[PDB]
Each structure stands twice: as C-alpha cells, then as structure tokens.
Amino acid sequence: TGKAWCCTVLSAFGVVILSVIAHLFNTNHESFVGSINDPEDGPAVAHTVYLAALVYLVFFVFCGFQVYL
Amino acid sequence: SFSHFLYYLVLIVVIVYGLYKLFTGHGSDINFGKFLLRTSPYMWANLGIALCVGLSVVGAAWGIFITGSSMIGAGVRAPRITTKNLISIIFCEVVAIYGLIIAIVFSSKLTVATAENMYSKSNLYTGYSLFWAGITVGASNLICGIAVGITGATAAISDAADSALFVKILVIEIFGSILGLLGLIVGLLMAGKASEFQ
Amino acid sequence: MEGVYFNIDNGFIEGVVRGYRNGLLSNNQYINLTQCDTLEDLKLQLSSTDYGNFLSSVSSESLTTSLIQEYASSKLYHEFNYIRDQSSGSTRKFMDYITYGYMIDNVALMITGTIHDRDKGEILQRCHPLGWFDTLPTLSVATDLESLYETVLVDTPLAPYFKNCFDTAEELDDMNIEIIRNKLYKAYLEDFYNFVTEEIPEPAKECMQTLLGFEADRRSINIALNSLQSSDIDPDLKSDLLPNIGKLYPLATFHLAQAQDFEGVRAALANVYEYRGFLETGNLEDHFYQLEMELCRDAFTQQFAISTVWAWMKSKEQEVRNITWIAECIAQNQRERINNYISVY
Amino acid sequence: EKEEAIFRSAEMALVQFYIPQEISRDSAYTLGQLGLVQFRDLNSKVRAFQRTFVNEIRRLDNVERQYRYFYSLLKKHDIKLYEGDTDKYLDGSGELYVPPSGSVIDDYVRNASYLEERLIQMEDATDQIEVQKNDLEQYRFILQSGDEFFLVNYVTGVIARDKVATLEQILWRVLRGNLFFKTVEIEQPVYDYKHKNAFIVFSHGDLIIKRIRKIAESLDANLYDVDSSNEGRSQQLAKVNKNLSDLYTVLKTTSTTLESELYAIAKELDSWFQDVTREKAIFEILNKSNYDTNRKILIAEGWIPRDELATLQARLGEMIARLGIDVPSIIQVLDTNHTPPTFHRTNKFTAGFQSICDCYGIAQYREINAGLPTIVTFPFMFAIMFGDMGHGFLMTLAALSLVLNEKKINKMKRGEIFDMAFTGRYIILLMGVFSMYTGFLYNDIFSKTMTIFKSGWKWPDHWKKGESITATSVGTYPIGLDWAWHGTENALLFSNSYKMKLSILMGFIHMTYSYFFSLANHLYFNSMIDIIGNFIPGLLFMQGIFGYLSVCIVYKWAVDWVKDGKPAPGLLNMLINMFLSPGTIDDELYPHQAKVQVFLLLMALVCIPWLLLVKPLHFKFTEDFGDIMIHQVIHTIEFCLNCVSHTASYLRLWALSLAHAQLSSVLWTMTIQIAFGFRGFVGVFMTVALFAMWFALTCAVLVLMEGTSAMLHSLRLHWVESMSKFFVGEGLPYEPFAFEYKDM
C-alpha cells in the first residue's frame, strides 16, 4: 500500500544519488573538495557513503517484497 | 487616550529642552544648519527614490479594493459589468507607473563622489531636490489613488442600475487622474537642473 | 472621511444591498398588478420582476392571500440572514439590535397564549423567525413575570430592559402586557441610540439619529390615543412609557401624557411642523408610512454608510404590505381601494 | 474530407426539419442518438409558462420525481443499487436505437403511480410502530440501571445532548438552594439521527414537580414512570421487556415484505431510469419548433457542422424507409446573419490545453484559436522559472506513470485533487521535459553543476591560500553557462545581468507573434480599415521603442568594447535621454545614433492620433459616433500602457528563477553538507536522516509550491499579456443535443 511506496521510491533514488556522490569524493572532483570549506580527505568520505547507501537498498528489497504481495 | 497622551508629552520635553538651552546661553547649539551640512547627501536622495515608488504604490493598491470589492458586489445580480467597469482599475494603476518612471530617472543621477568634493554646493542641492521631489510625487499620487477608487465604486453601482449613468461619471474620475499627472510634472522641474554627484 | 476605511470589511455588503433594491417595484410595476383578474394572472405577472418563480411548488387551487404574504417574507429573511452571516464586528451588532425588536413581539405573543390556554404548535407558526432564541418556547410555562424572568429571560440580551417592569400583580392579564411591551421600546430605542452615537461612524450617524427620532414619535403619540379608549390613566404612569430621543422630547412629551381628549393632543403636536397635520386629515397610519419612505429614500442617496440595511428592510416591508392589500382586493372583487398602495421608487 | 478545426472553428450553417406529426417523436430520437445538432428557439418570443406540449412533459417530470424517491428508500435501508458495469449496451455509440412504443412508456407512467402507493403504505406501517420501538427501548434502559441512579418527588426522561446544557442551568434558578441532578449518556445515537442523554431530578413535594414536568416537556423530553422500591421497578422491567420480544419479531416481518419488494424493484429500476429521461428531453426540443395547427408542419432549425451534412443526409434516408412515408424533403439550408457558435475538435492531448483558454473567454466564430501556441509557450515558461534538471526529472516520472496506466485509471473512481492531475497528465509531462533542457543551459542539478565540456576561462599558474585571484579568457563555452562561475564571488553580477536581458527579448518575441494573429484575422473577415486604423499604429509605436531596445542589446554583446578602447554605453541612460534630452548622448553605440532616436520618437507621437481619429472618421464619412469615438479613445489609453506594463511584467521570469536557486543552494548547504564533516556510525546516521529531510522538502516545497506559484504566472502571461492583443471574445458555445448517464 501507500505506506511502502514512500520508503520504496525514496530509497530507490537515495541509492542512485548517494552512489554518484561517493564516486566523486573518491575521484576528488573540484566542486566537492576543491574549496577549503569542503572536507580534505575524499576516500575517507566515500567509505561512509557506500554503507549508508546500502541501508536504502535494504528497505528497497524489504518493502519490495511487501508490495509484491 | 494613551497614544494621544504621548503627543502632549513630546511637546513638553521639547519646550523644557528648548528653554534650558536658552536661558543658560546655549541656543546656538541646537543648530539645524550643521544637521543639513554634515549629513550625507546620499541619505536624502535614496529616500525620495523609495518613497516615490513607496507612497505611490500604496495609492494604487488602496484604490483597487475600494473599487474591486464593490464591482464584485454588484456583479452578483448583474455580472455583465466586470468588463465595462474595468477602466477604473487602469486609472488606479497608472499612477504607479508614474512613480516607477521617476525612480528610474533619479537612479541615473546616483554616482560616486570624492571625499573632498562631497559636501559642496552642487551635491547638497541635488540631494535636497531629489528628496522633496520624491515626497511631492509620492503624496500626490497617493491621494489620486484614493479619489479615483471612491469615484470608481459609484460608477460600478450606477452601471448596475442603468447603464446610461456610467459615461457621465468618468468626467469626474478623469478629473481625478489629472492630479497624479501634475506632480509628475512639478517633480521633474525640481530635478531638471540638478546634476549627478561629482 | 466617508468611504476610505469602509470597504475594508463592509464593502461587499454595500454592493449586494444596492443590487437588491433595483429589484424594488416602481409605480409602473404596481399598476400591472392592479388590473389583474385573479391570483393566477398575478403569478404570471410577478415572475417578470425580481420575485421570479417563487410559486413553482404551488398549485392553482392553493392560491390564497395568506400563502402569498408568507412566501414573500420568507424571501426577505434568506436575504437578511445572508447579509448577517457575511458580516463582522460593529456591523454584526447593528444587525443584532434589529433582531432585538422582532423578538419582543414574540415575547408578548407567547405570554398571551398562556392567558388564553392555547397550544404552542398553533402559536409558534405565528411567531416571527428573526426574533428567535433557544429558550423561547419555555415562556409557555407560567403566568407570573418573575417566574418567566429568572427562568428564561435573564440569559437573553433583554436582561437590562426590565428594570421598570417588576411592579406586576400576581395575576397577569392582557391590558398589563401592552404596558410591559411598551416599556421595552422605551429602553431599546435608547440603548440602540447611545450605540449609534458612539461606535457607528459618520454619515450613518446623522441618518440613524433621525430614523430613531421617527420610530419614537410614532409610538409616543399612539400611546396618548389608545389611552382615550380606556377610562383613565395617571399622567405619571404615561411618562414611563414614552421614549426620550425624539423631536417631541422634552417639550411636547409633557402635554401628551396630560392630554385627555383628541383636541388637546393636536395642541401638543401643533408646535412641531414635522407632525402638524397628520391628525387633521385622512388615515393616520398612511401618513406615517409616507414619511417613512421619505426618510429611507434620502438614505439611499448617501453612499458608504451602513444605514442602507435598515432602510432596505423598512422599504421592503411596505412593499409586502402593498402586495397583500392589493391581493385581497383582486381576490374579493372589491376594486375600490386597490390604489391606496404606497410607493416612491 | 474532414476539416480539422483546431486553428479556426468549424464552418457550419443552419438547417430546417419539416417534421411530420406521425413521426414527430420517432425522427427526433435519431438526432439524440447521433448527437451533432444544436437548435435555436424561435418559440422564445412566446411566453414560457404556456407552451404546446406542456401537458406531456409536466406529466413526466412528476413521474421522474417519484423514481428518485424509490432510490431514496434504498439509501435508508441496508441495500445497494445493483448497477451496470458499462454503457455500451444502451446504444450510446453510433449504433442506432429503435424508440420504444407508447405502450412501453404508458406502462412506465402507470408503473410509477400505482407502485409507490404500495410503498407509501408499508413505510407508514413501519414508522407507526418504529416510533413505538424507540419510546419503549429507551424506557427499559433507565430501568436496567434503576438501582444506582437514586444513590413522588422525582422525575426521569431522555433529552438530546445540546438541550441538557440549557436545562441544567435553568433548574438552578428555579431552586437555588438544593438541586440533585445526575446524567447518563446513551452509547448509540437515536434516529429522529441525534444522540440523547438520560437524567433525573429530585425535588421537594408536588407543588414543584408538576412545573418541572412542564419545563422539561416544553423542551424535547420524554418523561417516563418508575416505581420507588427496587422490587417494583424490576416488575415494570419484567413486563415491558416482554412486549419488545413479541414486537421485535413483528418488525422483522413487516420490514421484509417491503425489502423483498424493494430488492425486486431495485434490480429493475436502473435500466428504465434513463429510458424516460430521453422521452421527456425529446419534447423539450420539440416545444421550440413552430407547431402549425391548420397544416401539420413542424419547423425546427438547428446548426450542424458542414463536414457531417452527408452523414445526416444519408442517415435520415434510412429512417424514412423504415416508416414507408418518404416525405418529399425534410432538409434545406440557407444563409442568415445570426451569430453561429464556436466548436473546436479536441483529442486527449489538446483538450487539457484547450480547457484553459476556454475559461477566460469563448472565441469569436472563425478566429484564431490560442490553444495551439499554448501547448508549448505555457510549459516552456515554467521551465525558465523552475529551471533545474533535478526537479524537472521528478515531475516527468509522476507524469510518466499517470499516462502509461491511463486505461486502468479511467475506469476506477477518483478523488478531486487526483482528477485534475489525470486531466492534465500531458501538461505535466512537458513541464518536466523542458525543465531538463533549461537546467542544462543554466547548468544546475540539485544546486550542483556539470563539467562536461572545456571551460573557456582559465586560472593563473600559481597562488596561495586566502589570496584573491581572477581568471583569463581563452575561448567560448559552447552550450550553456560555463562551469567556472559556480562558487565564485561575482556570479550573481552575471546571471542577474543575463537573465534580465533574456526575459526582455523573450517577452518582445512572444507578444509580437501574438500580435500578427490580428493581421491574419482582418485578412479573413476582409476588414482593411483596422489594418490601417488599429494594427499598424501599434506596430510602429512599440517596435520603435522596444524593438530598438531589443536590437541594441544584441549589438552590445557582439562588440569587443575593450579592444577598440571605447567605453560600453549604458542602455538605461540611452532610453531615457532620447525622450528627455533628445539629440544628446553620453556614450556612443553606433554611427548616427541620435539621428535615429529623434525619428523613432517622432514616429511614436504621430501614431497616437492616427490610432485615435482615422477609424471614427471612416464611420462619419462612410449619437452612434459618440459611441465609436469613446471606445476608440479607451483602446489607446489602454494599449499604449499595455505595451509598457506588460513588458515589465515578464520580469517575473527573472526572480522566480533567481529564487529557485537560493532555496535549492541553501537547502543543500544546511542539511547534507553538514554530514560530510562527520564520520563513524554516528556519521552513517546523520547522512541517512538528513537526506530524507532533504528529499522531503525537495519533493514538497520546491516541486509543488514553486510548481503552483510558477504554474499560475505562466497562465497569467497568456490571458493578460499575450492574448489581450488579438482576443475579442463574446462567442456562443456549441453544446449539441445528445445523451449520457446521470450520476444521480
């Protein structure tokens, strides 16, 4: 029902937005670590964003079985 | 009342303060001259540019809810009038366009001036003229925006009774819009001579 | 000045009322009623005017003169509760004092039913709807006033008006009710006059200070006349029934209480030209209704004032009083006094 | 062939039907089956209360009144109207329907009258004893708890909840000293539907209680009796509870005789509900014809699109072969001087865009429909404001869902907020697509930028921390805003001075394109005076002011003022001094500038009186002249200002684009950029919580609200700024005569 579509679509794009974000701190993209206020260490961040992105893949598959039934 | 009790008291402090400095031999210390020579001429100009468009736009929007709120009333039994009585909404708006033009004319004159040639003759005239040009054009159009709205609700009614009364009343509402055009003229003759800041 | 702060909240009320008046019947629209044969041609006629299809739920046989008067005032009250439900603030009170006058009529109409032992269902149909309150039918209980006062009428906004009324007997009768009913318009027309004096702005103030100077003169005189049918009434009692706002106040009020004949009354009214020759000629009540239009006809000449609402009703009740007056003449085939109807618009 | 009728209305003349009396009914049904004709009331000159076939229709609406009362009886009782799944088996499509005979319909009016009287009897019997049900069913409830209430001088009853607050404070004033009053709440509402409470009073003696029983029963209070001793009220309970045992089974008996019948009528009702609604509608349109008495001729004239003359001609011939009459002719067309109505053909796509232009005004017969340019200008202006690839992507998907599943969604029921979305599912699709093309030029995605192509700018070779730096140009960035501006100090001094000059040019183009539709209308109705009277003077006024303003802005951009050594002139002082101090300049733009300005100004002043005089004089030259002049005086005082206050009003394209960034680039900086400074499992949590708050505000504040606020300004720009150029209006709709199903 509607209570699962919320966490489904949210977790769906959440995986797709966070995965691209992690790939950019790793590669040291200018817009994300080029300035001084931005964090200095890239891969110290991408290791944190993979993990958080998995958490949304948990709720995408978990509530993905519930809407199926 | 309370808010009316203050106005009697502000008069009294100014009179005690006006005498204590006088019977002691300090009357020249309250010198409005230095308050006009030493104050920055940019303050007087950026008020006449905001009050001109400020007090004019209050005029237009005032005359619109006096006009529209009655047109909508008569148009519950006679809804045909909404397109014929629209004119009175135009004569309420045009005064705003009179103000929006002056603010752009005077914004051309705002420039940067040195520190030595700041408080000179040609720069104090400019500020004092751009100020009382913004008050005149912003007060005239503030009132034209009210005498047109009032006159615009009587025609919005008489049109609903018998249509023959409408055109006979715009001769009043057209003589109401002249007033907003006369300040637009006089406001420029002030600032026709004033030259931008050096 | 007048119309600068009016349209902020009371503007949409000004346009609707002045839309409802153009639907009033002019002299030409009354004449077409005068030559109608029956009440079925009448229905065909009024549909042309603002009354419209106001009898579509009615048959041809059911047409009577009472069913008309009932279905002409029902259209006035949905056009008043509408303006009353759309209002706010000071204009609400002005549209609430008007209801305080139509409920006092219902007070003296329920209490007389207790004197005569009639059923409330037969009565409440005769009660006026604008003067309703929730504790109204409970007035059918008892005969005493203190009984009906504390039980019911202290909660209502008629509390401050019975200050000069607790001299009643343990037995209450009809001639005492008319003395009770008339002591309230004495105070009502004052508390509604000090209100207009204070909270209503100009120019409605000058207009309504006149229309209350009239409604008090209509009652200050007619008390002196009905007292002639009776044997005697003390003069000190009469001064507690006369309002204190009108033109007759204070000078002429002295000589109306102290006038024991029809001739001594005209000596009291001879000293004011507004009320000079009404007694000298013709049906008296038709002279008042003629001056009532002429004071309401001058209120519509104004704009940006909330005195039009008062005038709108009083100008539209005389309208309905002319429909029925003509409705009886046509139905009964007496076509003699069919043209006595009053009209200004 | 087939006329499309989306660029202009459908050309159509009116046609008469000399209908016989024998087949007056049977021929008129066929038009209702066909559904392409609108009739004109010649009978309106005659009064409305007395007409020819009133004896017929007056009988039927009373018969149609009663069927709604059959449906009402279904509502009260626990019954459902067994309905049809579709409307494809009632001949609503092109397939024909032979009309019922009089015996079929005379039975209906008969079936309406004798049937209900049985139902009016059965319901009176139920109500006569159902009021006896509740009066006693309450009488036992006060007895069940009769023990604990008290812990003749007392009374009991049942009152509605609102009146208890009125009653409880009245009895205080009657008896100030002592007042012993309790209350109990009934769990289930009584059907009268109103809740009710129970109560009890204890008084002193008999002088008072006879008065309280009046005060209570004056209000809606059912006073009952109870014995004082607890042994006694158990006896009263023992006897009344038995009467309800026998009574209740009787209710179940008298009810079912009504319900088995009501169940029987309900299945039949829905079929021959509509079949009478047609039969009265047919006579409503036959009233409007002239019915001659001495000669049996019925004259009815109506409009029909010219494409379907032949279908009507071919179809009519088949009916008269079913009859055997074959009248010599029942069809003929003439030309007259009335105002024909307006009909544009619409598919699923063009309809949600045509529902917008209709709300402002019905278009004149055979003018330009403004609904074709509104397909693209409307959602594209939304893109200028909305202007972001990230948000525009989201709008597309919710429009890519509603569209694909449209066949499921069509059948099922819907709310009201959800219908408007499905009605405009094709409007939202484009707004999401074109919002992705803009944001690629603006170079914004969720407040971030795209770094695909090379940057024509360039930085120095070396610098240090906290040291300010400035760039060097190399070449030009091909497609969009070069990505070196992001994060920069003086960015907004570029976008602001850019997006202004965009909206001016985009407002100068949309208006003039809407303004040449005037020309393509005067050339149709062959009204050449307005070309020389109305069109051209306004063309020469504003093109000579804002066309001069729009062309100079492009010239200033294709000139390297730095290399030549000349200073770049300002454009505000250029537009002002040419009115006030003509012939004067402060900074030059091009040769003979002052030569052109004075002529353009001279051109405008002559176009005011030439817009003002030539058209009235043409009438006088060939009372009314006073009407033609004053309306032409107002066409000038409006139009000249409308050439100004509209051009400023396109600068809402500027700000709402400027706002959507400073909400997005703040909402990114306050929520998610926080988390990128934390680490550990505490860092894994703040990223996950702050994201869903970013995704939520994004999907609620920036897509919906800024969608709707920007959705309405685009509507505004059409109705007021663009459509005001050519739109006259005062049209007549095309609402033909055909049938459908009633929601009831």
Swiss-Prot record, chain A:
Q: How does it sit in the membrane?
A: Multi-pass membrane protein
Transmembrane portions of the chain:
5-25, 49-69
What intrachain disulfides are recorded?
A: none
The principal localisation class reads endoplasmic reticulum
A Gene Ontology biological process term: endosomal lumen acidification
Q: Which residues lie on this side of the membrane: Cytoplasmic?
A: 26-48
Per UniProt, subcellular location reads as: Endoplasmic reticulum membrane; Vacuole membrane
Keyword Membrane assigned to the entry: answer is yes
- Top-rank taxon, per record: Eukaryota
The UniProt keywords, alphabetically, are: Endoplasmic reticulum, Membrane, Transmembrane, Transmembrane helix, Vacuole
MF annotations from Gene Ontology: proton-transporting ATPase activity, rotational mechanism; RNA endonuclease activity
Could you list the residue ranges forming a coiled coil in this record?
A: none
Choose one Gene Ontology CC annotation of this protein and give it. Answer: endoplasmic reticulum membrane
How this chain assembles, per its entry, is:
V-ATPase is a heteromultimeric enzyme composed of a peripheral catalytic V1 complex (components A to H) attached to an integral membrane V0 proton pore complex (components: a, c, c', c'', d, e, f and VOA1).
Query: What biological function has been recorded for the protein in this entry?
Result: Accessory component of the V0 complex of vacuolar(H+)-ATPase (V-ATPase), a multisubunit enzyme composed of a peripheral complex (V1) that hydrolyzes ATP and a membrane integral complex (V0) that translocates protons. V-ATPase is responsible for acidifying and maintaining the pH of intracellular compartments.
Q: What is this protein called?
A: V-type proton ATPase subunit f
Q: Which organism is it from?
A: Saccharomyces cerevisiae (strain ATCC 204508 / S288c)
Question: What portion of the full-length protein is represented by this chain?
Answer: 7 to 75 of 85
Curated annotation (Swiss-Prot), chain B:
The record's principal subcellular location, in a coarse class, is: membrane
Q: Which GO terms describe its cellular component?
A: fungal-type vacuole membrane; Golgi membrane; membrane; proton-transporting V-type ATPase complex; vacuolar proton-transporting V-type ATPase complex; vacuolar proton-transporting V-type ATPase, V0 domain
- GO BP, sorted A to Z: endosomal lumen acidification; Golgi lumen acidification; proton transmembrane transport; vacuolar acidification
Q: Any ranges marked Cytoplasmic in the topology annotation, and which?
A: 21-46, 107-129, 190-198
Site annotated as Essential for proton translocation: where? 93
Parts of the chain on the Vacuolar side: 68-85, 151-168
Q: What membrane topology does the UniProt entry give?
A: Multi-pass membrane protein
One Pfam family here: ATP-synt_C
A single GO molecular function, which one? P-type proton-exporting transporter activity
Query: What is the top-level taxon of the source organism?
Result: Eukaryota
Q: Which residues cross the membrane?
A: 1-20, 47-67, 86-106, 130-150, 169-189
Please give the InterPro entries that the UniProt record associates with this protein.
Answer: ATPase_proteolipid_c-like_dom, ATPase_proteolipid_csu, F/V-ATP_Csub_sf
Q: Does the keyword Flavoprotein apply?
A: no
- Provide the alphabetized UniProt keywords: Hydrogen ion transport, Ion transport, Membrane, Transmembrane, Transmembrane helix, Transport, Vacuole
Q: Where in the cell is it found?
A: Vacuole membrane
The protein's job, in short, is:
Proton-conducting pore forming subunit of the V0 complex of vacuolar(H+)-ATPase (V-ATPase), a multisubunit enzyme composed of a peripheral complex (V1) that hydrolyzes ATP and a membrane integral complex (V0) that translocates protons. V-ATPase is responsible for acidifying and maintaining the pH of intracellular compartments.
Query: Sorted alphabetically, which PANTHER family does this protein's record hold?
Result: V-TYPE PROTON ATPASE PROTEOLIPID SUBUNIT
* Family membership noted in the UniProt record: Belongs to the V-ATPase proteolipid subunit family.
Record protein name field: V-type proton ATPase subunit c''
Q: What is the species of this protein? A: Saccharomyces cerevisiae (strain ATCC 204508 / S288c)
> What is the gene name?
VMA16
From Swiss-Prot, chain C:
For molecular function, the Gene Ontology terms on record are: proton-transporting ATPase activity, rotational mechanism
Organism of derivation: Saccharomyces cerevisiae (strain ATCC 204508 / S288c)
Gene3D superfamilies referenced in this protein's UniProt entry, alphabetically = ATP synthase (C/AC39) subunit, domain 3, V-type ATP synthase subunit C domain
Return the protein name.
Answer: V-type proton ATPase subunit d
Q: Cite the entry's keywords alphabetically.
A: Acetylation, Hydrogen ion transport, Ion transport, Membrane, Transport, Vacuole
Q: Which InterPro entries match?
A: ATPase_csu/dsu_sf, ATPase_V0-cplx_csu/dsu, ATPase_V0-cplx_dsu, V-type_ATPase_csu/dsu, V-type_ATPase_csu/dsu_dom_3
Residue stretches in coiled coil: none
Indicate the family of this protein.
Answer: Belongs to the V-ATPase V0D/AC39 subunit family.
Swiss-Prot record, chain D:
Q: How does it sit in the membrane?
A: Multi-pass membrane protein
Query: Which terms are listed as keywords in the entry?
Result: Acetylation, Coiled coil, Glycoprotein, Hydrogen ion transport, Ion transport, Membrane, Transmembrane, Transmembrane helix, Transport, Vacuole
GO CC, one annotated term:
fungal-type vacuole membrane
What are the protein's GO molecular function terms? ATPase binding; phosphatidylinositol-3,5-bisphosphate binding; proton-transporting ATPase activity, rotational mechanism
- Stretches assigned to the Cytoplasmic side: 1-367, 406-419, 518-535, 722-744
Query: What PTM annotation applies here?
Result: Glycosylated.
The extra comment attached to this record reads: Present with 55714 molecules/cell in log phase SD medium.
Q: State the family named in the UniProt similarity comment for this chain.
A: Belongs to the V-ATPase 116 kDa subunit family.
Q: What's the protein called, per UniProt?
A: V-type proton ATPase subunit a, vacuolar isoform
The upper taxonomy is: Eukaryota, Fungi, Dikarya, Ascomycota, Saccharomycotina
Q: What gene name is listed for this protein?
A: VPH1
